[PDB]
Paper text:
Although the actual cellular role of this protein is unknown, it has been observed that mutations of the PLPHP encoding gene affect the activity of [name]‐dependent enzymes, B6 vitamers and amino acid levels. Here we report a detailed characterization of the [name] ortholog of PLPHP ([name]) with respect to its [name] binding and transfer properties, stability, and structure.
We serendipitously discovered that the [name] variant of [name], affecting the lysine residue that binds [name] at the active site, is able to bind [name] covalently. This observation led us to recognize that a number of lysine residues, located at the entrance of the active site, can replace Lys36 in its [name] binding role.
Numbering used by the authors: 3 to 228
The structure:
């Protein structure tokens, strides 16, 4: 049951924030609906969920248009997959968030292709904090430069950071990797304006990411099936 799983996840988020002294309201739940059918999002929507994440551009845009045409308003769509330049326009025209900015060129394309009547596309810069097997995300030593360049793009808005740590089963390592991300997030927050989003944590490392200071968890399996 999707509705039951939504309520179960929100309780686990709420408990995890409370245990480490944070308000549950600090944590945004991003329902990762990738590869799930639109009918499943429809249940989530009917269960009160508004923020959905997609990894593939055309699947996402098709869903976005599906619910726009039903006249469902109030939804927030996050693109959280890797973004190739030949699909940037669909993202720039349809999505509300993009978590996967790791090169200045993809950000400038999104900026140029974003219609002016839309709000600025909220973007996060993706850090490869701990994955040698991923060709996605930058190193922390490159963050200040990319952030400063992306910060001037007027049709974008730099909101913070995202990372997908290498899979890790040890809670100790989960927390320490997430802390590195929280530390970098806090440093960015000092100088840049409106830095409020640390996209960090999935089903299995939710608690350490919340304890470390994530503001947004990306949950798929625990809501929709694997
Ligand atoms: C499940 C699914 N939906 C949609 C797409 C749409 O492809 P793209 O993201 O390259 O537009 C893909 C393939 O990449 C996919 O695997
Ligand atoms: C960026 C991102 N977040 C979250 C998930 C899925 O999260 P979960 O482990 O709960 O299925 C994936 C999808 O495979 C992902 O690529």
């Amino acid at each position: 049951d999707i509705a039951h799983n939504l309520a179960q996840v929100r309780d686990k988020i709420s408990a995890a924030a409370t245990r480490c002294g944070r308000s549950p309201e600090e944590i945004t739940l991003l329902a990762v609906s990738a590869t799930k059918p639109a009918s499943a999002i429809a249940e989530a929507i009917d269960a009160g969920q508004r923020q959905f994440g997609e990894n593939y551009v055309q699947e996402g845009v098709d869903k976005i248009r599906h619910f726009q045409e039903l006249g469902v308003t109030g939804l927030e769509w996050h693109f959280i997959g890797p973004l190739q330049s030949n699909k940037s326009r669909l993202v720039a025209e349809h999505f509300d968030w993009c978590h996967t900015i790791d090169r200045l060129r993809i950000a400038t394309r999104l900026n140029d292709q974003r219609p002016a009547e839309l709000p600025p596309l909220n973007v996060l810069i993706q850090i490869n904090i701990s994955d040698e097997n991923s060709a996605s995300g930058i190193q922390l030593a490159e963050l200040d430069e990319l952030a400063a360049a992306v910060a001037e793009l007027p049709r974008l808005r730099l909101r913070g950071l995202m990372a997908i740590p290498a899979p890790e089963s040890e809670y100790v390592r989960q927390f320490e990797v997430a802390r590195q991300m929280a530390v970098a997030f806090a440093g960015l927050k000092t100088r840049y304006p409106h830095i409020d989003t640390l996209s960090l944590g999935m089903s299995d490392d939710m608690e350490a990411a919340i304890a470390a200071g994530s503001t947004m968890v990306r949950i798929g399996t625990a809501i929709f099936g694997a």
